[PDB]
Amino acid sequence: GSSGSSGSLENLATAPVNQIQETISDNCVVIFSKTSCSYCTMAKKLFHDMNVNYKVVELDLLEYGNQFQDALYKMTGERTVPRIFVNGTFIGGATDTHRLHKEGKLLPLVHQCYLKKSKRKEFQSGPSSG
């Protein structure tokens, strides 16, 4: 916690939020959690047991954690952890994600990120200069 000399941050067009959007877009499953909660392990245990290659990231340890921490809070609307992101959509948290698998509302997506990738007759948005 820090008080005073607050209410002013450098201006830039490279917010930490955009950096994440790309991560979830490329990757298949990203779990943004910290090392201050217990549920943090639940998520890992859930996927780990499912044998579904997952990608967790500890913000607490990350120097710029307080940053990527907020950006997410806006994409989810809450500040709870861990945080599971599938297909650029906050399907829910540790508990929620756990329930889905049961109702089979999580697998249907897990088999999508990778699906529809193999080279095929399809136009995709890509950068180009010369």
Backbone as a ProteinNet text record, in pm:
[ID]
protein_1_A
[PRIMARY]
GSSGSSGSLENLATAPVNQIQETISDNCVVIFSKTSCSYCTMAKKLFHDMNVNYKVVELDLLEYGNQFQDALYKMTGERTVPRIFVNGTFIGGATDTHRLHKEGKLLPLVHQCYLKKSKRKEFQSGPSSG
[TERTIARY]
80.7	0	84.3	45.1	118	21.9	39.1	-46.4	33.8	-36.7	29.5	98.8	137.8	205.1	144.4	11.7	-58.8	-160.5	-207.3	-304.4	-240.2	-138.4	-67.8	24.1	-5	74.8	115	237.7	288	188.2	182.6	91.4	160.5	96.3	151.5	40.4	71.4	-25.6	3.6	76.2	111.2	63.8	-61	-118.4	-92.5	-87	-62.8	-180.7	-296.4	-416.7	-405.9	-361.7	-346.7	-246.4	-139.3	-36	-94.6	-197.2	-262.2	-353.4	-435	-527	-456.2	-332.2	-253.8	-214	-183.7	-143.9	-256.1	-376.8	-492.6	-531.6	-503.2	-535.5	-446.7	-316.4	-220.7	-230.9	-213.3	-220.3	-358.8	-376.2	-503.7	-573.2	-494.8	-548.7	-448.4	-487.6	-401.2	-466.6	-392.9	-443.7	-367.1	-425.6	-362.9	-400.6	-306.8	-330.2	-208.1	-224.4	-115.6	-80.9	9.4	51.3	3.3	-120.5	-178.4	-310.3	-356	-481	-457.2	-556	-545.7	-601.2	-715.9	-779.6	-679.3	-572	-468.5	-424.7	-418.4	-377.8	-490.8	-613.2	-730	-727.6	-722.6	-719.7	-614	-491.6	-381.5	-415.3	-464.3	-500.7	-610.2	-704.2	-814.3	-762.1	-686.6	-630.4	-528	-432.4	-328.5	-388.5	-495	-561.7	-626.6	-672.7	-736.9	-633	-505.9	-397.1	-407.4	-458.6	-473.8	-367	-268.8	-160.5	-213.3	-175.6	-219.2	-100	-128.4	-23.8	-61.2	3.3	-23	81.4	42.9	133.1	113.2	218.7	212.8	242.1	140.2	155	222.3	186.4	243.5	395.5	456.7	601.7	647.7	565.9	598.1	613.8	724.9	751.9	636.7	589.2	479.4	345.6	330.9	207.5	90.9	111.3	6.8	-52.2	23.1	-21.9	-118.7	-65.7	-147.5	-263.3	-253.7	-357.5	-484.9	-468.9	-582.7	-643.6	-560.4	-606	-706.3	-674.7	-762.2	-892.1	-879.8	-996.3	-1101.5	-1056.3	-1146.3	-1206	-1127.6	-1172.9	-1265.6	-1260.7	-1344.1	-1448.6	-1410.5	-1502.1	-1483.5	-1397.8	-1371.5	-1221.4	-1185.4	-1045.3	-1019.2	-1064.6	-1046.4	-950.4	-886.9	-792.6	-812.8	-764.9	-696.8	-792.2	-738.8	-819.1	-792.8	-893.8	-881.5	-940.3	-862.9	-907.3	-903.7	-1020.2	-1030.4	-1093.5	-1020.6	-1069.4	-1095.2	-1005.7	-1020.5	-1149.9	-1202.3	-1326.7	-1315	-1342.4	-1335	-1446.9	-1431.7	-1531.4	-1565.5	-1475.4	-1497.9	-1369.7	-1383	-1266.4	-1238.5	-1164	-1130.1	-1255.5	-1345.4	-1469.4	-1548.7	-1585.8	-1661.9	-1600.1	-1473.7	-1403.1	-1419.1	-1414	-1428.1	-1567.2	-1669	-1806.9	-1828.9	-1777.9	-1791.9	-1752.6	-1627.1	-1577	-1680.3	-1745.8	-1847	-1965.2	-2017.1	-2130.3	-2085.1	-1953.9	-1899.9	-1908.8	-1902.6	-1910	-1771.9	-1668.5	-1531.2	-1451.6	-1474.9	-1405.6	-1438.9	-1567.9	-1615.8	-1531	-1468.2	-1384	-1237.8	-1193.7	-1056	-1018.7	-1118	-1095.7	-1126	-1110.9	-1136.8	-1012.2	-945.9	-825.3	-730.4	-704	-614.8	-685.4	-813.5	-892.5	-901.9	-911.5	-921.6	-791.1	-679.6	-548.3	-474.3	-468.5	-400.4	-420.8	-315.8	-321.8	-442.4	-523.4	-642.2	-681.2	-766.9	-812.4	-894.7	-826	-892.9	-808	-872.7	-803.2	-796.8	-675.7	-655.9	-587.8	-626.9	-569.9	-422.7	-335.9	-193.4	-124.3	-20.6	56.1	140.1	172.3	252.1	295.7	420.9	475.1	536.3	636.8	702.3	742.2
-120.6	0	126.1	223.3	349.1	466.7	567.7	685.9	809.7	914	1036.9	1024.6	1138.2	1139.7	1036.1	1027.4	932.2	1003.3	933.5	991.6	1048.2	979.2	1023.5	913.7	865.6	760.5	798.9	764.2	795.1	752.3	828.6	798.7	714.6	605.1	516.3	441.5	392.9	319.1	169.5	125.5	-15.2	-70.7	-41.2	-88.4	-237.4	-280.2	-420.6	-510.3	-449	-523.5	-582.6	-500.6	-544.8	-659.3	-650.5	-753.4	-889.4	-888.3	-1011.4	-1066.4	-978.9	-1018.7	-1104.9	-1068.9	-1142.9	-1279.8	-1285	-1409.7	-1512.6	-1469.8	-1558.4	-1596.2	-1507	-1530.8	-1640.3	-1628.7	-1726.7	-1857.4	-1848.8	-1966.4	-2030.3	-2139.9	-2210.5	-2192.1	-2194.7	-2178.3	-2108.5	-1993	-1916.4	-1896.4	-1928.9	-1914.4	-1806.8	-1687.6	-1576.3	-1576.8	-1618.8	-1624.6	-1575.4	-1557.9	-1511.4	-1615.8	-1579.7	-1670.2	-1621.3	-1573.2	-1523	-1593.3	-1675.5	-1748.9	-1899.3	-1976.7	-2122.1	-2179.1	-2127.1	-2173	-2178.1	-2100.7	-2096.3	-2237.1	-2326.2	-2464	-2544.5	-2518.3	-2588.4	-2591.7	-2473.8	-2463.2	-2555.5	-2545.2	-2627.8	-2776.1	-2815.4	-2954.4	-2999.9	-2910.6	-2941.5	-2980	-2889.6	-2914.1	-3027.2	-3016.1	-3117.4	-3257.6	-3277.4	-3406.9	-3441.2	-3338.6	-3357.9	-3382.9	-3365.3	-3386	-3288.1	-3168.7	-3066	-2958.2	-2960.8	-2863.2	-2724.2	-2674.7	-2543	-2449.7	-2320.5	-2220.7	-2123	-2137.8	-2050.7	-1939.9	-1828.3	-1714.9	-1647.6	-1646.1	-1584.8	-1435.3	-1354.1	-1209	-1157.4	-1216.3	-1176.5	-1167.7	-1268.3	-1272	-1176	-1161.8	-1072.8	-929	-866.4	-728.6	-636.9	-653.5	-572.2	-642.7	-709.8	-780.4	-686.5	-587.3	-490.4	-431.2	-440.2	-387.6	-484.1	-596.1	-696.5	-740.7	-708.9	-745.3	-665.3	-535.6	-447.9	-476.2	-470.1	-495.1	-609.8	-718	-834.8	-802.7	-741.9	-705.9	-635.8	-571.1	-500.2	-595.2	-694.2	-792	-894.6	-903.3	-997.4	-924.6	-809.6	-732	-757.2	-853.3	-887.3	-893.7	-917.1	-925.5	-1051.5	-1165.5	-1292.9	-1383.2	-1475.5	-1568.3	-1709.9	-1809	-1784.6	-1734	-1710.9	-1662.3	-1744.4	-1818.5	-1901.4	-1831.3	-1826.8	-1762.8	-1861.1	-1886.5	-1978.4	-1910.3	-1909.1	-1847.1	-1698.2	-1632.8	-1490.7	-1458.2	-1555.2	-1536.3	-1589.9	-1503.9	-1542.6	-1640	-1764.9	-1867.6	-1873.1	-1821	-1820.8	-1838.6	-1858.3	-1876.3	-2022.3	-2047.4	-2183.5	-2268.9	-2225.5	-2298	-2316.7	-2205.7	-2209.9	-2308.9	-2286.2	-2373.3	-2519.8	-2547.2	-2683.5	-2738.3	-2656.1	-2696.4	-2726.9	-2639.5	-2657	-2798.3	-2834.2	-2966.7	-3074.2	-3059.5	-3155.1	-3156.3	-3037.9	-3025.5	-3038.5	-3047.2	-3059.9	-2930.4	-2818.1	-2687.1	-2623.1	-2702.9	-2654	-2727.1	-2857.3	-2938.8	-2892.5	-2865.1	-2819.3	-2705.8	-2629.7	-2517.9	-2560.4	-2640.3	-2688.4	-2755.1	-2813.5	-2880.7	-2787.3	-2657.3	-2557.7	-2474.2	-2430.5	-2349.8	-2409.6	-2539.1	-2608.3	-2638.2	-2672.2	-2703.2	-2582.2	-2608.2	-2501.5	-2423	-2495	-2432.2	-2478.6	-2610	-2667.3	-2580.2	-2567.1	-2486.9	-2525.7	-2426.6	-2450.5	-2325	-2342.1	-2230.5	-2132.2	-2042.1	-1942.6	-1816.5	-1700.9	-1573.1	-1526.1	-1499	-1453.4	-1316.9	-1233.8	-1100.2	-1107.6	-1058.3	-1060.2	-932.2	-892.6	-771	-784	-670.4	-669.1	-527.2	-513.3	-382.9	-386.5	-471.7	-483.3	-626
0	0	0	-81.6	-91.3	-106.6	-22	-25.7	-64.9	-107.4	-147.3	-281.5	-338.4	-467.8	-561.8	-561.7	-646.6	-735.3	-838.3	-929.3	-1054.3	-1104.7	-1224.4	-1277.1	-1397.4	-1459.3	-1601.2	-1639	-1772.3	-1879.5	-1988.2	-2097.9	-2204.9	-2244	-2345.6	-2418.7	-2538.4	-2618.4	-2615.9	-2513.5	-2499.5	-2365.6	-2330.8	-2205.3	-2185.7	-2058.7	-2023.5	-2059.1	-2082.2	-2117.3	-2257.4	-2352.3	-2490.5	-2500.6	-2422.3	-2422.3	-2385.8	-2301.4	-2258.5	-2367.7	-2425.6	-2531.4	-2635.5	-2666.9	-2765.1	-2710.9	-2581.6	-2517.3	-2522.7	-2487.1	-2488	-2630.6	-2724.7	-2865	-2923.3	-2899.8	-2949.8	-2871.9	-2740.4	-2654.5	-2661	-2587.8	-2585.1	-2450.5	-2343.2	-2208.7	-2117.5	-2064.7	-1975.7	-1839.4	-1733.8	-1597.9	-1521.8	-1513.7	-1443.7	-1295.8	-1211.5	-1067.8	-990.7	-860.1	-774.8	-669.2	-578.5	-472.2	-336.1	-331.4	-207.3	-176.4	-270.1	-253	-260.9	-217.1	-218.7	-348.8	-391.3	-514.2	-629	-616.4	-719	-758.2	-659.7	-683.6	-746.6	-702.3	-754.6	-907.1	-968.3	-1113.7	-1173.3	-1122.6	-1170.7	-1158.2	-1041.1	-1016.2	-1112.2	-1140.7	-1231.2	-1369.3	-1430.8	-1563	-1558.5	-1466.8	-1452	-1454.9	-1377.9	-1371.7	-1505.4	-1576.2	-1705.8	-1814.7	-1779.8	-1874.7	-1991.3	-1963.3	-2065.8	-2051.7	-2141.1	-2138.7	-2104.2	-1986.8	-1942	-1923	-1910.1	-1891.2	-1780.2	-1665	-1551	-1541.2	-1480.2	-1464.1	-1328.7	-1247.9	-1115.7	-1123.7	-1097.8	-1102.1	-975.2	-861.8	-733.6	-742.3	-803.8	-818.8	-928	-1031.8	-1142.9	-1094.7	-1132.2	-1092.9	-1133.3	-1256.2	-1307.3	-1287.6	-1173.7	-1144.6	-1121.4	-1035.2	-1004.1	-1131.7	-1240.8	-1369.2	-1436.8	-1485.1	-1552.2	-1463.1	-1334.4	-1238.8	-1263.6	-1287.6	-1312.9	-1449.9	-1553.4	-1689.6	-1693.7	-1623.4	-1619.1	-1545.9	-1428.5	-1348.5	-1433.9	-1540.9	-1631.1	-1734.2	-1775.4	-1873.6	-1809.2	-1676.7	-1603.1	-1519.4	-1464.8	-1383.3	-1235	-1201.8	-1062.4	-1035.4	-909.7	-870.7	-788.6	-839.9	-771.5	-848.1	-776.5	-837.9	-785.1	-861.9	-989.4	-1097.2	-1216.6	-1328.2	-1454	-1498	-1617.3	-1739.3	-1847.3	-1970.5	-2087.2	-2146	-2258.6	-2379.6	-2490.8	-2613.5	-2592.6	-2519.2	-2493.3	-2421.6	-2347.2	-2273.6	-2131.4	-2033.8	-1893.4	-1857.8	-1900.7	-1873.5	-1725	-1642.1	-1498.7	-1419.9	-1289.1	-1204.6	-1174.6	-1067.4	-1028.1	-1012.3	-924.4	-899.8	-1028.6	-1091.3	-1215.6	-1313.9	-1348.2	-1441.4	-1402.7	-1272.8	-1222.7	-1253.1	-1230.4	-1255.2	-1403.1	-1489.2	-1633.3	-1675.1	-1649.9	-1684.6	-1651.9	-1537.2	-1494.1	-1590.5	-1621.3	-1712.3	-1857.6	-1877.4	-2011.6	-2090	-2019.4	-2083.1	-2092	-2068.2	-2073.7	-2181.3	-2193.2	-2292.3	-2433.8	-2458.2	-2588.9	-2645.2	-2556.2	-2597	-2606.3	-2509.6	-2507.1	-2639	-2705.3	-2832.8	-2949.6	-2926.2	-3029.5	-3057.1	-2950.5	-2963.2	-3066.7	-3054	-3146.3	-3278.3	-3269.7	-3388.3	-3480.6	-3610.6	-3709.4	-3718.2	-3725.3	-3734.4	-3859.5	-3878.8	-3994.5	-4118	-4198.4	-4319.9	-4404.9	-4440.6	-4521.8	-4599.4	-4699.4	-4781.3	-4698.6	-4628.9	-4546	-4533.1	-4543.9	-4533.7	-4388.7	-4341.1	-4204.1	-4201.4	-4105.4	-4092.2	-4052.4	-4140.2	-4112.7	-4155.6	-4080.5	-4109.3	-4235.9	-4296.9	-4419	-4454	-4496.5	-4532.8	-4672.6	-4690.3	-4819.3	-4851.5
[MASK]
++++++++++++++++++++++++++++++++++++++++++++++++++++++++++++++++++++++++++++++++++++++++++++++++++++++++++++++++++++++++++++++++++

